[PDB]
């Protein structure tokens, strides 16, 4: 828990740090598969810059 109970909370403030260990894993397994997209889209980008010349 990240709040003093009974206090006045601002919007967008952490109330409870929930266990991330199965969501941090998916967030890495999206960001891991992000880099599977934007390494291949690095190259298909760079092929076209080698073909426009």
């Amino acid at each position: 828990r990240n709040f003093k109970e009974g206090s006045d909370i601002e919007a967008g403030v952490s109330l409870y740090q929930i266990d991330p260990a199965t969501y941090q894993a998916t967030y890495d397994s999206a960001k891991g598969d992000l880099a599977k997209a934007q390494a291949a889209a690095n190259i298909a980008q760079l092929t076209v810059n080698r073909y426009q010349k």
Partner: protein
């Protein structure tokens, strides 16, 4: 037969030139497809040479 040999050699050899003058224009295009293809990186230096 000798005169017509040379006259039909030179009529060949004009067309032989215009063959191999195009074969330069082929190979000069293929070379410049390499020098532009190697300066950007798609073809290597041995595919140039």
């Amino acid at each position: 037969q000798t005169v017509r040999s040379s006259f039909n050699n030179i009529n060949a050899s004009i067309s032989s030139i215009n063959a191999y003058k195009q074969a330069v224009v082929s190979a000069q295009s293929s070379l410049d497809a390499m020098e532009a293809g190697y300066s950007v990186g798609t073809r290597t230096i041995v595919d140039v040479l």
